[PDB]
Amino acid sequence: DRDDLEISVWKTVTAKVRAEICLKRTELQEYDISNAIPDIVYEGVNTKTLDKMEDASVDRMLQNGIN
Amino acid sequence: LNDNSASVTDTGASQHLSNVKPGQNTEVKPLVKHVLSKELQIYFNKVISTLAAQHMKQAALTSLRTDSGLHQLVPYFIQFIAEQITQNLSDLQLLTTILEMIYSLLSNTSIFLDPYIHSLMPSILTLLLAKKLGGSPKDDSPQEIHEFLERTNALRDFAASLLDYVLKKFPQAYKSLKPRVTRTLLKTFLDINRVFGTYYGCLKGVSVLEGESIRFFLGNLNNWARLVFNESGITLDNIEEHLTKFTKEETQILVDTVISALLVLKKD
Amino acid sequence: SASDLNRIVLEYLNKKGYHRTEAMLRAESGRTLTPQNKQSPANTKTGKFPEQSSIPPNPGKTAKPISNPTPENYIRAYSMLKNWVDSSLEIYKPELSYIMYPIFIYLFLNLVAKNPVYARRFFDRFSPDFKDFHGSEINRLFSVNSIDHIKENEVASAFQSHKYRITMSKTTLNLLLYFLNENESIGGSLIISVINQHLDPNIDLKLEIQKVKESRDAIKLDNLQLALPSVCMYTFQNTNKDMSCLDFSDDCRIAAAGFQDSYIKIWSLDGSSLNNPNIALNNNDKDEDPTCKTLVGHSGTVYSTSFSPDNKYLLSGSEDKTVRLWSMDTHTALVSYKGHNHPVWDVSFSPLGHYFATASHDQTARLWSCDHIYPLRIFAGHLNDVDCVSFHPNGCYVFTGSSDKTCRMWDVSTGDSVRLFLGHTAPVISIAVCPDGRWLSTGSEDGIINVWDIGTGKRLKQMRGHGKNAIYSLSYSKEGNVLISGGADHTVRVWDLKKATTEPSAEPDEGDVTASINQDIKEYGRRRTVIPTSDLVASFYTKKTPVFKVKFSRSNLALAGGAFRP
C-alpha cells in the first residue's frame, strides 16, 4: 500500500499538524470545522461576460467586415 | 466573536494561490467555553453520554433530529463524532450509533449544515472505505469469519446508503461533492493492494451513484478483474477452485455486487 | 401633560359607562404585559392546523391577552406516515414496506363505520401500490361501503376478532413510537390508538408509550440561546438606479424585481431554464433566453411586489392605479385589480394565501381577495399615507404603518382599528410581527427599530444601531426571536429581542476586547455618532450596495438582496 503518490505525500507532509489536532480534539486541510464556506448552486457572471463581449466584437470583426 | 533570494515569492505565489482556490477564512471562533450557556452544555453532555437504555438513546436521537436551538453545539457534535470514529474504530455498535446521529442531524431541517459538508463527508467516506473496521475477527472458525464479515458488511451497506442521503440533502453543492466523492471512489478502487471490505465499500458507493458515472466505470472494470481475480489465460471452467487474494465467499460477493450496480445501466 | 391625559381618560370612562371597580380593573388589565404562550408557533405536538371550512376569519369568540393560560381526518393522518416511510430507501425500508399494509386496512375498516365517502376517498387513494403484494384481497374489499357491508366480507368481520400479528424489532418499534410521539395532533395519536387497539406487536404497550413520552420529556431545550445567521447576498449589477424593491420566492428559486420603466424582471436564482417546457417542445429556440423573463403589463412604475406562499403567482403593485396578477408558469398577466386612485406602495398576500392587503398614497389600506376585482374592506384612520402593510401570521389582523409616525392594527372583519401604536419620530417604513404573535416590531426612516406588545400596546424597548437613515426590510427567525434588519446604510444587522424584557433568553455564563471600544473611539464626536443598544450583536456591511430585501429561510440561512449602486 505504498505505490500511491498523492496519499503517501499527504501522510508525510501533514504528519505533525494532524497529531496536534487529534490531541486537541479529545478535550489544504479539510477538517477545520469553523473556517469553511459553503458552495452556491449558481453565481452570476461578473468578469467572463466582459471578455465574452470583447471577443464577440472581435468575431464581428472576424466576419469579413460586415456591420 | 471573531478570533481577536527573496522569500516573498513563496508566500505570494503558492500561499495565496493555493489558498484562494479553496475559499477564504477569517477565523471563526469555536472554543473559549464562554460561548455556551450552562443549560446548553448540560444538554450537550446529556446527549453525548447516552450515545431500558435504548429508549434514552432514541430520545437523544430524536432530540437531535427535531429540536431547534442547537446551532451553537453543531460544531461540537462534528468534533465528538470525528473523534469517536477515528479514535474508536473497532466497535461496530458505537459506529452504528454514530452513523445514526449523523443521519439524525442530517434530517434536521432547522440547522444550517452546508458549511460543515467537508468535515462530515470524510466520516462517511472512512466508515465506507476503511482498511479495517472491526479489527478483531476471532479467527480459526469459518462461522466466525462469516459472522464478522456480515457484521462489517452491515456498516458498509449502512454508510453507503448514508452517502446517497447527503448527495440529495445538499443538491446546491452539486459539482462540488459529486465529482469529489466519485474521484475518491475511483482513486480508492483502482488498485490491487487493498483488503476486500474496502473494495466492497467502493462498489456499494458506486451503486449509490447513478447514470453515466456508473458507465464511467465500464471500461476500467475488465483490467480490474484481470488483476484482482487472476484469469491469466483461463477458459472459465475450473473457476470454483482456481483462485488468489480472496476466499470463495467474498469473490462470490464481489461478482454479485459488481452486477448489483450494473443493472442500473441496462434498465434504461 | 400625561397626568391631565390620565384624568381625561378617567372622566371619559366615567361618562362612557364604566363602573369604578370596572375601570380600575380595566386599567390594571391594560398595564400588565401579555404573558407567555408556551405553544407560541403551535409546536407540532399540541398544535393544530387551521380549519378549511370555507368561511372568512372572525376575531371573536376570544378572551383577553392579559389572562394567563392559552375531526383530524384519516387520509392526511395516514399520508404523513406514508410519506415518512416513502422518503427512505435506507436499511429500514422493507420493514416499513411490511408494516404499511395493516395500518391502512384497519384505518379503512375504522373509517367505513363513520364516514363512507371519506372511506371511498381513502381506499382508492392508496389502492394500486401493493395490489401485486397482497393479491385479490383489495378486490374483495371493493364491496365494503357500510357497517352492514362489513358483515358480508368474512375477513373484514374477522379483522375485529383476529388481531393482526406482526413481529417487529426493537429499533423499528422505537423508531415508530418516537416518530408518532413527536407529532401527536397531526394524526400520530390517531395512528397510535389504532396500533394499540387493533394490532399484535411481537418483540403491555401503554407503559411503553409512557416510557417513550417520559424519556422524550427528560431531554429537551427549555430556554434557547441566540444563533448568528448566515446571510447569502444577491447583488444586482446593471440597474442604473431604476430597480425598486425586490422579493424572493419560497424555495428561493425565483426573484422578482420591479423596475422604474414598467417591467417586472424574473430571475431563476438557480440558473434554470425558466421556460416551463412541460415536454411540449414545439419550437422557438431562435429567441434569446438569458434564464430571465420580463413581464410587461403595467403603465406606471412598480413600487412593490409580493409572492404567494403557493409560489405559483406574483402580485405586482404599480403607480398606475392597478395591482396585477401574474402566473409564474406561463409568464403572462391574469387579473387586473382596480380599487385605488393613488399609487400603490405595498402589496402583501395573506399567510394562507387567501386574500391580499394593499397600501397606497390615499391614506387608506384596502383588503382584497384574489377572486374579486374590487376591494372588500377599507382601512381608514391614518393621518398621512400608508407605507407598509403586513398580516398577523394567522391572517386575522392587519398591520399598517404610515408616514405620520404611527402604525395601527385593524380587525379584518369589522374593519375598524383595534390598536394604535405611538412613539416613533419618522415615517414607519417596514413592519413585521413575530411568529409568537405577541410582539410587533417596526422600523422607521430614523434608523430606529422598536418593539411593542399587542396586549398592552406600549413600548417594551427600542433598537438604536442603524444609521440615521431608512430601514428597508425586516425579517424574523423561524423558531424564536432574532430580528434581521436590512436597511439603507448598506448593513444587515442582527438583533436580540429578549434582552431588556422579562424574558432574558439564556445568556452565556462567563468577555471581549472589541466590545465597548468601537463606539468609544468617537472620532466624529459624541453628539455626531450613533450609540447602539445592548440588543445589537452583529452587523454585516455590503460594500456600497444597499439591501432592499431580507428573507430568513427555514434553516437559519437568511438571504439579502439589493442592487449594486454605482
UniProtKB/Swiss-Prot annotation, chain A:
Name of the molecule in the record: SAGA complex subunit SPT7
Superkingdom: Eukaryota
Purpose: Component of the transcription coactivator SAGA complex. SAGA acts as a general cofactor required for essentially all RNA polymerase II transcription. At the promoters, SAGA is required for transcription pre-initiation complex (PIC) recruitment. It influences RNA polymerase II transcriptional activity through different activities such as TBP interaction (via core/TAF module) and promoter selectivity, interaction with transcription activators (via Tra1/SPT module), and chromatin modification through histone acetylation (via HAT module) and deubiquitination (via DUB module).
Coiled-coil segments on the chain, per record: none
Other known facts: Present with 2360 molecules/cell in log phase SD medium.
Segment of the intact protein contained: 728 to 888 of 1332
Subunit-structure text: Component of the 1.8 MDa SAGA (Spt-Ada-Gcn5 acetyltransferase) complex, which is composed of 19 subunits TRA1, SPT7, TAF5, NGG1/ADA3, SGF73, SPT20/ADA5, SPT8, TAF12, TAF6, HFI1/ADA1, UBP8, GCN5, ADA2, SPT3, SGF29, TAF10, TAF9, SGF11 and SUS1.
Modified how: Protease PEP4 directly cleaves the C-terminus of SPT7(SAGA) to form SPT7(SLIK) within the SAGA complex in the nucleus.
Subcellular location: Nucleus
From Swiss-Prot, chain B:
UniProt keyword Transcription regulation, yes or no: yes
UniProt GO molecular function: chromatin binding; identical protein binding; molecular adaptor activity; protein heterodimerization activity; RNA polymerase II general transcription initiation factor activity; RNA polymerase II-specific DNA-binding transcription factor binding; transcription coactivator activity
Transmembrane segments: none
GO biological process, one term: positive regulation of transcription by RNA polymerase II
CC annotations in GO: cytosol; nucleus; SAGA complex; SLIK (SAGA-like) complex; transcription factor TFIID complex
Compartments reported by the entry: Nucleus; Cytoplasm
Chief localisation class: nucleus
Record's keyword terms, sorted: Cytoplasm, Nucleus, Transcription, Transcription regulation
Keyword Transcription attributed: yes
Notes on the domains: The histone-fold domain (HFD) is required for interaction with TAF9.
Additional record remark: Present with 6506 (+/-1290) molecules/cell in log phase SD medium.
Subunit architecture: Component of the 1.8 MDa SAGA (Spt-Ada-Gcn5 acetyltransferase) complex, which is composed of 19 subunits TRA1, SPT7, TAF5, NGG1/ADA3, SGF73, SPT20/ADA5, SPT8, TAF12, TAF6, HFI1/ADA1, UBP8, GCN5, ADA2, SPT3, SGF29, TAF10, TAF9, SGF11 and SUS1.
Function: Functions as a component of both the DNA-binding general transcription initiation factor complex TFIID and the transcription coactivator SAGA complex. Binding of TFIID to a promoter (with or without TATA element) is the initial step in pre-initiation complex (PIC) formation.
UniProt similarity note: Belongs to the TAF6 family.
Name of this protein: SAGA complex/transcription factor TFIID complex subunit TAF6
Organism field: Saccharomyces cerevisiae (strain ATCC 204508 / S288c)
Native organism taxonomy: Eukaryota, Fungi, Dikarya, Ascomycota, Saccharomycotina
Residues of the full protein shown: 173 to 467 of 516
Swiss-Prot record, chain C:
Membrane-spanning residues: none
Key words of the record: Coiled coil, Nucleus, Phosphoprotein, Repeat, Transcription, Transcription regulation, WD repeat
Record PTM Phosphoserine, positions in chain: 555
Stretches for region Disordered: 27-70
Pfam families: LisH (PF08513), TFIID_NTD2 (PF04494), WD40 (PF00400)
InterPro entries: G-protein_beta_WD-40_rep, LisH, TFIID_NTD2, TFIID_NTD2_sf, WD40/YVTN_repeat-like_dom_sf, WD40_repeat_CS, WD40_repeat_dom_sf, WD40_rpt
Keyword NADP tagged: no
WD repeat copies, ranges: 238-277, 297-336, 339-378, 381-420, 423-462, 466-505
Subcellular location per the Swiss-Prot or TrEMBL entry: Nucleus
Family: Belongs to the WD repeat TAF5 family.
Entry text on domains: The C-terminal WD40 motifs are required for its incorporation into TFIID and function in SAGA.
Subunit relationships: Component of the 1.8 MDa SAGA (Spt-Ada-Gcn5 acetyltransferase) complex, which is composed of 19 subunits TRA1, SPT7, TAF5, NGG1/ADA3, SGF73, SPT20/ADA5, SPT8, TAF12, TAF6, HFI1/ADA1, UBP8, GCN5, ADA2, SPT3, SGF29, TAF10, TAF9, SGF11 and SUS1.
Other information: Present with 14834 (+/-203) molecules/cell in log phase SD medium.
The protein, known as: SAGA complex/transcription factor TFIID complex subunit TAF5
Origin species: Saccharomyces cerevisiae (strain ATCC 204508 / S288c)
Organism ancestry: Eukaryota, Fungi, Dikarya, Ascomycota, Saccharomycotina
